[PDB]
């Protein structure tokens, strides 16, 4: 169930161990794609499954004619999707520059289908992606608790919490705008919004507990590059009216250096800059002394991130906490022989003789809605909500 | 060998207390019961006596020749314990 250093722990010692880790100089969180399935998202297995069911003609070409994907993992549903999209984009650009007509129209169909499939599943509320006050709904109840508990546990004079993620949906922004918090994501301006890498060095001050940081490692639905060689950000309504509507209800793919998700168009030196900056900043954070990190919802299928995390244990003051539901299955599959790279990677660090590593397993005791409650509220935090009963009366005066 | 258990160290022979080798002390709230312990043992340590006046239930302060330095201890619970207690009034007055 719960392992630290190779042996077992109980609920009370673990709950007391979590509390002391939140009072260190640096605190961070790393979230994956499984943290959004409780509010309308999907896992990569489901995306591949639905694509494989919907488009059975294009699947033969990718396997036979161009060798972009293998058979065994296609059957098992273990393909990396953003790597496939990046490779397809490279193929299309090469075909375009050397003037081959047969392949240029062949790859447009594949790319448009892949974008349709991955865009449809990231709109967490369907047609109501346009309207305002989306964070007021009950699906976003636990993101607010996460942010509140993570801010209110800092003593004055300590740094603000930092958040990393591999998603490209808008759950955290909608949740944070409803509390009254301001997040720094690297952009500034309203009528023309641009990316400045030095916005991560600023903080507010009162001249008479406001802010946090957000790092998006795979892009976002509202980032695009125009005819000018700069990257812009717009709001959800404007993006929906501009290009998101046509992706879903039409056969539209005519700009190839436009969208900045998921990890696509890395061969352009204007677009690769953003990804490089995000990853460098992530690598610098876990190299500081007196640091703690929590990981939840992330399946250890990335070689670069695994390489970074392991090399940081060489410092005596770095601690990490990991959540992995399907743990027994991995243990049996690797003791008997076999398993993929994720299973070997997680099992090899579960068995170390380190007091800096903690692994939590279970069925639904390692889910996102179980991670939030292990984190405590302070004794003087106000919890009784009595301003809404006043707002309803104010509106009832009419 | 002798083992003595009293709640009034002040009502004891000054020679009997002064000729022990190990002392255990639970909460002791009276200014004349602390003087007996003070004069029974040596000087050279006063920061340790101020604790005894505010120990909780079940803690002790041990010092002697079986201990390299004085310790504050949280004692385990015996199983099975001694006889529970004397009679209780509420049960008998409600046995209609």
């Amino acid at each position: 169930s719960i392992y630290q250093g190779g042996n077992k722990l109980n609920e009370d010692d673990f709950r007391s161990h979590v509390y002391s880790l939140c009072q260190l100089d640096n605190v961070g969180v790393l979230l994956g794609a499984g943290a959004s399935v409780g509010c309308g998202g999907k896992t990569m297995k489901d995306v591949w499954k639905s694509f494989k069911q919907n488009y059975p003609e294009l699947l033969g070409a990718l396997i036979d004619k161009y060798l972009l994907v293998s058979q065994i993992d296609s059957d098992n549903n273990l393909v990396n999707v953003e790597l496939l999209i990046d490779e397809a984009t490279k193929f299309l650009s090469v075909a375009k520059t050397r003037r081959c007509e047969d392949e240029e129209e062949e790859f447009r169909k594949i790319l448009s289908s892949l974008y349709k499939e991955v865009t449809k599943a990231a709109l967490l509320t369907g047609e109501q992606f346009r309207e305002k006050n989306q964070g007021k709904k009950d699906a976003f109840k636990y993101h607010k608790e996460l942010i509140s508990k993570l801010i209110s546990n800092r003593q004055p004079g300590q740094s603000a919490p930092a958040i990393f993620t591999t998603n490209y949906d808008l759950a955290l922004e909608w949740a944070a705008e409803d509390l009254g918090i301001q997040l720094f994501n690297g952009f500034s301006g309203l009528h023309t919004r641009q990316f400045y890498p030095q916005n991560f060095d600023l903080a507010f001050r009162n001249v008479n507990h406001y802010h946090a940081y957000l790092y998006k490692l795979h892009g976002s639905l509202t980032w695009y590059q125009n005819d000018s060689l700069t990257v812009n950000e717009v709001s959800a309504s404007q993006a929906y009216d501009e290009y998101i509507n046509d992706i879903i209800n039409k056969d539209d793919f005519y700009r190839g250096q436009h969208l900045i998700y998921p990890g696509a168009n890395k061969y352009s030196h204007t677009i690769g800059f953003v990804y490089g900056e995000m990853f460098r900043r992530f690598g610098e954070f876990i190299s500081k002394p007196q640091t703690a990190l929590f990981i939840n919802g992330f399946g250890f299928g990335d070689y670069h991130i695994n390489r970074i995390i392991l090399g940081a244990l060489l410092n005596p003051s770095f601690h990490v906490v990991i959540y992995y539901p399907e743990l027994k299955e991995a243990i049996t599959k690797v003791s008997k022989g076999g398993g993929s790279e994720a299973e070997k990677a997680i099992v090899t660090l579960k068995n170390m003789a380190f007091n800096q590593v903690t692994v939590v397993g279970g069925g639904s005791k390692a889910y996102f809605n179980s991670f939030v409650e292990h984190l405590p509220y302070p004794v003087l935090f106000p919890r009784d909500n009595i301003v809404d009963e006043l707002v309803e009366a104010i509106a009832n005066l009419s | 060998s002798l083992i003595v258990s009293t709640q009034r160290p002040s009502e004891l022979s000054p020679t009997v207390l002064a000729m022990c080798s190990n002392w255990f002390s639970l909460r002791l709230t009276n200014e004349r019961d602390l003087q007996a312990l003070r004069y029974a043992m040596e000087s050279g340590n006063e920061q340790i006596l101020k604790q005894i006046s505010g120990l909780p239930r079940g803690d002790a302060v041990a010092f002697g020749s079986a201990f390299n330095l004085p310790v504050r201890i949280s004692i385990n619970q015996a199983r099975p314990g001694p006889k529970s207690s004397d009679a209780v009034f509420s049960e008998e007055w409600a046995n209609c």
Partner: protein
């Protein structure tokens, strides 16, 4: 590729005024906790234990004061002995007439040294019974040699309703299961 110590520092000595010690903290420490290879330890509250590295021994001290002087912080401490290494393990000596040097680093005390401080001799372990745990941290277990207890006399003191009879029962029951050829009345 060289590591002199696998533990971080807390502050450095800035003055000596006889037998009292004065320490200045660094800039980052605000949350009263410091971490290492084994876990997290508290360092700033009065009554705690810390240590200074002096050559090839470790000097052990106890905290008394803590105040202001972003402003700086300060600490006062007193020494109560030192820890030494002889063959393959460690021993604790209770002589406290040695002081560190100006600039000496101050370190937290991990849980491995804490076991050494509250320990009995290795050859006497078969002659020991268990009483309880450390009260401030509740990690270390306390043992005592029966030979050194029941050689001279022993005293048990306390008020009413605080646990004298519990200790008497716990102590007397164990001795019967270790030295069955013993007289107790």
């Amino acid at each position: 590729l060289f590591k002199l110590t696998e533990i971080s520092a807390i502050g450095y000595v800035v003055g000596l005024e006889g037998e009292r010690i004065r320490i200045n903290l660094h800039e980052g420490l605000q949350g009263r906790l410091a971490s290492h290879r084994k876990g997290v330890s508290s360092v700033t509250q009065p009554g705690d234990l810390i240590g200074f590295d002096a050559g090839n021994i470790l000097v052990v001290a106890r905290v008394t004061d803590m105040a202001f002087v972003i402003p700086l912080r300060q600490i006062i401490a007193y020494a109560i002995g030192f820890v030494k290494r002889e063959l393959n393990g460690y021993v604790f000596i209770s002589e406290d007439w040695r002081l560190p040097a100006l600039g000496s680093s101050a370190v937290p005390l991990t849980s491995d040294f804490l076991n050494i401080i509250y320990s009995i001799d290795k050859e006497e372990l078969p002659k020991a019974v268990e009483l309880g745990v450390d009260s401030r941290t509740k990690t270390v277990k306390i043992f005592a040699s029966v030979d050194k207890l029941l050689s001279r006399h022993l005293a048990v003191l306390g008020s009413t309703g605080y646990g004298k009879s519990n200790f008497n029962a716990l102590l007397t029951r164990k001795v019967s299961e270790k030295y069955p050829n013993s007289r107790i009345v």
